[PDB]
Amino acid sequence: MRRYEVNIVLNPNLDQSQLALEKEIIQRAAENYGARVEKVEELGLRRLAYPIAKDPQGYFLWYQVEMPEDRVNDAARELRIRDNVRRVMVVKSQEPFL
Closest by CA position to 79, among listed 15, 3, 1, 9: 9
What is the C-alpha to C-alpha distance for residues 48 and 67, in angstroms, rounded to an integer?
28
Closest by CA position to 2, among listed 38, 26, 40, 45: 38
Cβ atoms of 6 and 88 within 8 Å: the answer is yes
Closest by CA position to 44, among listed 21, 61, 22: 61
For the chain, the helix, strand and coil percentages under 3-state DSSP, each to the nearest 5: 30, 50, 25
Cβ atoms of 31 and 71 within 8 Å: the answer is no
What domains, with CATH codes, occur in the chain? Answer: 1-98 (3.30.70.60)
